[PDB]
Amino acid sequence: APNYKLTYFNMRGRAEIIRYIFAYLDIQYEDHRIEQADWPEIKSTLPFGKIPILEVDGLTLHQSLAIARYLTKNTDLAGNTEMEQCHVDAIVDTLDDFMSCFPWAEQDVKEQMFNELLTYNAPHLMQDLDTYLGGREWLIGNSVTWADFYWEICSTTLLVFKPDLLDNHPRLVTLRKKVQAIPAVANWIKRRPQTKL
Amino acid sequence: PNYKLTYFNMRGRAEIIRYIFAYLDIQYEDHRIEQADWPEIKSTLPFGKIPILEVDGLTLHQSLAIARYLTKNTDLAGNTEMEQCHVDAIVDTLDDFMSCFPWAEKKQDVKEQMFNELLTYNAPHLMQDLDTYLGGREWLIGNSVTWADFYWEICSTTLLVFKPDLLDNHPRLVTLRKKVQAIPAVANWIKRRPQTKL
Ligand SMILES: Cc1cc2ccccc2c(-c2ccc(C(=O)NCCN3CCOCC3)cc2)n1
Ligand SMILES: Cc1cc2ccccc2c(-c2ccc(C(=O)NCCN3CCOCC3)cc2)n1
Ligand SMILES: N[C@@H](CCC(=O)N[C@@H](CS)C(=O)NCC(=O)O)C(=O)O
Ligand SMILES: N[C@@H](CCC(=O)N[C@@H](CS)C(=O)NCC(=O)O)C(=O)O
Ligand SMILES: [Mg+2]
């Protein structure tokens, strides 16, 4: 077991997928949460100047999904075949693309853009996901993968700004319930610092 | 496998897939659609986006998910599991930046404004970071070319159209482009491919 140190803000955000993975695999790690106020001099120290980063035995990794993928390699979270891994990867990038469209670090242009994405794109993404899932218990294959984790994670944040997101998609709510019922995840959820984002 | 790649008639987000097919000498249908046909095809797609790759009657989407799938167990994948993490990380950093550009913006003044801000204010910092990350090494990750090297060349070719002086202070990054373009399979694809601006 190597020594892990995750660095991010005190929020779920882009680090949370890494945090679910560690919790599910029961891998001990240091969950380092920096203060908004300290982000300047921290940022200048990093190779690509962004967080989260994951230090592994003195080697600094970056890019939340590159890290997530690395940590789930050779686990039951990866998806069984090379094809399934493609589906896991595609679903995760689809969710990530959409979340990336929101101007998180913007103030009056921010509200317009949020509503554009939540009123136009969101229902379309929801319908596409529901169709893609259709009937299966999990998003890829017959067991849980880190794509299901990411669905639960991204949808939790989207529901903050659009509470009715899933009112007409009970099958996508069922997937959220299934992720939250995993004892390791339920346990993390109750223990993690409560944040809006 | 019978492969059919569907995208616009441009390099764009499909080009990484095209480079991989060329390097591995794999046959595929390079299906290029017009804008006028786009409404009719869009409703058929899994998430309404292109590129998609059809494989023996099954549809894959997401260019980098597909790129990664195609390079699994080939020499374009990282040599180790951690190198594969470095490859993904570099690819996503490139894609992130490229994704900030409003490529589909129908208001040309807004588009041009956002393009100018990203190219003069943001691009130089990313070019510095990539150059520092490369250092004196031959390839971005490990001892040999990976699809991250392909994606650097693909993305920088497009960025150089709009900012020709992008790599003026980064000769080692320009040498990396030249090495990728010199790989025979890539060299011939650059000659074969339809000549488009983007
Ligand atoms: C679950 C998830 C997934 C995301 C995927 C792509 C992009 C952003 C994502 C986010 C996300 C990321 C960041 C924020 C977010 O609130 N960012 C602002 C950064 N703050 C730093 C401290 O000082 C104030 C500004 C909100 C949401 N969350
Ligand atoms: C190499 C590369 C990489 C990219 C990575 C992320 C996002 C966009 C990328 C692009 C890219 C993608 C799209 C465009 C682009 O020109 N998009 C416009 C889309 N259509 C408008 C209607 O007519 C048909 C074209 C330009 C560049 N290229
Ligand atoms: N795709 C990257 C994005 C990294 C990113 O842009 N993170 C934000 C925090 S949510 C950041 O560091 N932005 C602040 C800055 O650039 O200073 C990832 O998933 O890790
Ligand atoms: N991250 C995705 C992006 C897919 C995407 O947004 N592609 C664009 C074309 S470059 C698209 O389908 N947009 C047209 C539309 O939304 O109608 C990928 O790499 O495949
Ligand atoms: Mg991405």
Short mmCIF file of all heavy atoms in Angstrom, two decimals, chain A residues 161-183:
data_model
loop_
_atom_site.label_atom_id
_atom_site.label_comp_id
_atom_site.label_asym_id
_atom_site.label_seq_id
_atom_site.Cartn_x
_atom_site.Cartn_y
_atom_site.Cartn_z
N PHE A 161 -28.58 23.12 -8.27
CA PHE A 161 -28.99 24.25 -9.11
C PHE A 161 -30.27 23.98 -9.91
O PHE A 161 -30.90 24.92 -10.38
CB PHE A 161 -27.88 24.63 -10.09
CG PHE A 161 -26.58 24.95 -9.42
CD1 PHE A 161 -25.62 23.97 -9.23
CD2 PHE A 161 -26.33 26.24 -8.95
CE1 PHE A 161 -24.41 24.26 -8.60
CE2 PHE A 161 -25.13 26.54 -8.32
CZ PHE A 161 -24.17 25.55 -8.14
N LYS A 162 -30.63 22.71 -10.07
CA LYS A 162 -31.85 22.33 -10.77
C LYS A 162 -32.51 21.19 -10.00
O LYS A 162 -32.37 20.03 -10.35
CB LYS A 162 -31.53 21.90 -12.21
CG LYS A 162 -32.76 21.64 -13.09
CD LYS A 162 -32.36 21.37 -14.55
CE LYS A 162 -33.52 20.80 -15.37
NZ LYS A 162 -34.68 21.71 -15.43
N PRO A 163 -33.23 21.54 -8.91
CA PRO A 163 -33.85 20.51 -8.07
C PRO A 163 -34.78 19.52 -8.79
O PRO A 163 -34.94 18.40 -8.32
CB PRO A 163 -34.64 21.33 -7.04
CG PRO A 163 -33.93 22.63 -6.97
CD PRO A 163 -33.37 22.89 -8.33
N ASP A 164 -35.37 19.93 -9.92
CA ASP A 164 -36.31 19.08 -10.66
C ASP A 164 -35.66 18.24 -11.76
O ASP A 164 -36.35 17.64 -12.58
CB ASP A 164 -37.46 19.93 -11.26
CG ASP A 164 -37.03 20.79 -12.46
OD1 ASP A 164 -35.86 20.74 -12.89
OD2 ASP A 164 -37.90 21.52 -12.97
N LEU A 165 -34.33 18.19 -11.74
CA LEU A 165 -33.54 17.57 -12.81
C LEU A 165 -34.09 16.20 -13.18
O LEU A 165 -34.28 15.90 -14.36
CB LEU A 165 -32.08 17.45 -12.39
CG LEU A 165 -31.08 16.84 -13.37
CD1 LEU A 165 -30.71 17.82 -14.48
CD2 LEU A 165 -29.86 16.38 -12.61
N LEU A 166 -34.38 15.39 -12.16
CA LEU A 166 -34.70 13.98 -12.34
C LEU A 166 -36.14 13.64 -12.01
O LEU A 166 -36.49 12.46 -11.87
CB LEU A 166 -33.78 13.15 -11.45
CG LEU A 166 -32.27 13.32 -11.70
CD1 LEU A 166 -31.47 12.45 -10.74
CD2 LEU A 166 -31.93 12.98 -13.14
N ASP A 167 -37.00 14.65 -11.89
CA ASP A 167 -38.38 14.40 -11.50
C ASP A 167 -39.09 13.46 -12.48
O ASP A 167 -39.99 12.73 -12.08
CB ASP A 167 -39.15 15.71 -11.37
CG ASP A 167 -38.74 16.51 -10.14
OD1 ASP A 167 -37.93 16.02 -9.32
OD2 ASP A 167 -39.24 17.64 -10.00
N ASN A 168 -38.68 13.47 -13.75
CA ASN A 168 -39.26 12.58 -14.76
C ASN A 168 -38.33 11.45 -15.19
O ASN A 168 -38.56 10.81 -16.22
CB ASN A 168 -39.72 13.39 -15.98
CG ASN A 168 -40.84 14.36 -15.64
OD1 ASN A 168 -40.89 15.47 -16.17
ND2 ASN A 168 -41.75 13.95 -14.77
N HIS A 169 -37.28 11.19 -14.40
CA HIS A 169 -36.33 10.12 -14.70
C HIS A 169 -36.07 9.23 -13.48
O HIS A 169 -34.95 9.19 -12.96
CB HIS A 169 -35.01 10.70 -15.23
CG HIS A 169 -35.16 11.43 -16.53
ND1 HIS A 169 -35.23 10.79 -17.74
CD2 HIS A 169 -35.28 12.75 -16.80
CE1 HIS A 169 -35.36 11.68 -18.71
NE2 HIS A 169 -35.39 12.88 -18.16
N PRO A 170 -37.09 8.47 -13.04
CA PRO A 170 -36.96 7.59 -11.89
C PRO A 170 -35.87 6.52 -12.04
O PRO A 170 -35.31 6.08 -11.03
CB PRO A 170 -38.34 6.93 -11.79
CG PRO A 170 -38.91 7.02 -13.15
CD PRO A 170 -38.43 8.35 -13.65
N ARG A 171 -35.55 6.11 -13.27
CA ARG A 171 -34.51 5.11 -13.48
C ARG A 171 -33.11 5.68 -13.20
O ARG A 171 -32.22 4.93 -12.80
CB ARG A 171 -34.58 4.49 -14.88
CG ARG A 171 -35.83 3.63 -15.10
CD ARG A 171 -35.60 2.57 -16.17
NE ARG A 171 -35.16 3.14 -17.44
CZ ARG A 171 -35.97 3.62 -18.39
NH1 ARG A 171 -37.30 3.63 -18.24
NH2 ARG A 171 -35.43 4.10 -19.51
N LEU A 172 -32.92 6.98 -13.42
CA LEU A 172 -31.66 7.63 -13.08
C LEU A 172 -31.59 7.91 -11.58
O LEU A 172 -30.49 7.94 -11.01
CB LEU A 172 -31.48 8.93 -13.88
CG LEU A 172 -31.43 8.75 -15.40
CD1 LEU A 172 -31.22 10.10 -16.09
CD2 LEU A 172 -30.32 7.78 -15.79
N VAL A 173 -32.74 8.13 -10.93
CA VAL A 173 -32.78 8.25 -9.48
C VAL A 173 -32.43 6.91 -8.82
O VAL A 173 -31.64 6.88 -7.86
CB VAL A 173 -34.16 8.75 -8.97
CG1 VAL A 173 -34.14 8.91 -7.44
CG2 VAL A 173 -34.54 10.08 -9.63
N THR A 174 -32.99 5.82 -9.36
CA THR A 174 -32.67 4.45 -8.94
C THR A 174 -31.15 4.17 -8.97
O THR A 174 -30.59 3.57 -8.05
CB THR A 174 -33.43 3.41 -9.81
OG1 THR A 174 -34.85 3.58 -9.63
CG2 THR A 174 -33.05 1.98 -9.43
N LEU A 175 -30.47 4.62 -10.02
CA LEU A 175 -29.01 4.48 -10.07
C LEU A 175 -28.33 5.26 -8.94
O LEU A 175 -27.37 4.78 -8.35
CB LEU A 175 -28.50 4.92 -11.44
CG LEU A 175 -27.04 4.67 -11.78
CD1 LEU A 175 -26.65 3.19 -11.59
CD2 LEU A 175 -26.83 5.13 -13.23
N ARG A 176 -28.83 6.46 -8.62
CA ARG A 176 -28.28 7.24 -7.51
C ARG A 176 -28.47 6.49 -6.19
O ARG A 176 -27.54 6.42 -5.38
CB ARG A 176 -28.91 8.64 -7.42
CG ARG A 176 -28.54 9.57 -8.58
CD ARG A 176 -29.38 10.83 -8.58
NE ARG A 176 -29.55 11.37 -7.23
CZ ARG A 176 -28.61 11.99 -6.53
NH1 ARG A 176 -27.40 12.18 -7.03
NH2 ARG A 176 -28.89 12.42 -5.31
N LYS A 177 -29.67 5.96 -5.98
CA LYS A 177 -29.98 5.14 -4.79
C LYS A 177 -29.07 3.92 -4.69
O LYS A 177 -28.65 3.55 -3.59
CB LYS A 177 -31.43 4.63 -4.83
CG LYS A 177 -32.53 5.68 -4.70
CD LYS A 177 -33.82 5.13 -5.32
CE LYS A 177 -35.05 5.89 -4.94
NZ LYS A 177 -36.28 5.24 -5.52
N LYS A 178 -28.78 3.29 -5.82
CA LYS A 178 -27.94 2.08 -5.82
C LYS A 178 -26.50 2.38 -5.42
O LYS A 178 -25.89 1.61 -4.67
CB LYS A 178 -27.99 1.37 -7.18
CG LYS A 178 -29.23 0.48 -7.38
CD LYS A 178 -28.88 -0.84 -8.06
CE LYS A 178 -29.96 -1.89 -7.86
NZ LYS A 178 -29.46 -3.26 -8.20
N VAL A 179 -25.96 3.51 -5.89
CA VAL A 179 -24.61 3.94 -5.51
C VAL A 179 -24.56 4.29 -4.02
O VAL A 179 -23.65 3.88 -3.29
CB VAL A 179 -24.15 5.16 -6.35
CG1 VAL A 179 -22.79 5.66 -5.89
CG2 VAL A 179 -24.10 4.79 -7.84
N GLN A 180 -25.56 5.04 -3.56
CA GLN A 180 -25.65 5.48 -2.17
C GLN A 180 -25.88 4.33 -1.18
O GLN A 180 -25.58 4.47 0.01
CB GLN A 180 -26.76 6.53 -2.02
CG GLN A 180 -26.44 7.86 -2.69
CD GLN A 180 -27.60 8.84 -2.67
OE1 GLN A 180 -28.62 8.61 -2.01
NE2 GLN A 180 -27.45 9.95 -3.40
N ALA A 181 -26.41 3.21 -1.66
CA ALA A 181 -26.64 2.01 -0.83
C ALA A 181 -25.40 1.13 -0.66
O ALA A 181 -25.41 0.22 0.16
CB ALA A 181 -27.77 1.18 -1.41
N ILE A 182 -24.34 1.39 -1.42
CA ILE A 182 -23.08 0.67 -1.25
C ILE A 182 -22.48 1.09 0.11
O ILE A 182 -22.17 2.27 0.30
CB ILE A 182 -22.08 0.99 -2.38
CG1 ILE A 182 -22.64 0.53 -3.73
CG2 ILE A 182 -20.73 0.33 -2.13
CD1 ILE A 182 -21.71 0.85 -4.89
N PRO A 183 -22.34 0.15 1.06
CA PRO A 183 -21.95 0.56 2.42
C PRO A 183 -20.72 1.49 2.48
O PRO A 183 -20.74 2.46 3.25
CB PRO A 183 -21.66 -0.77 3.12
CG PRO A 183 -22.51 -1.76 2.41
CD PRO A 183 -22.59 -1.30 0.98
#
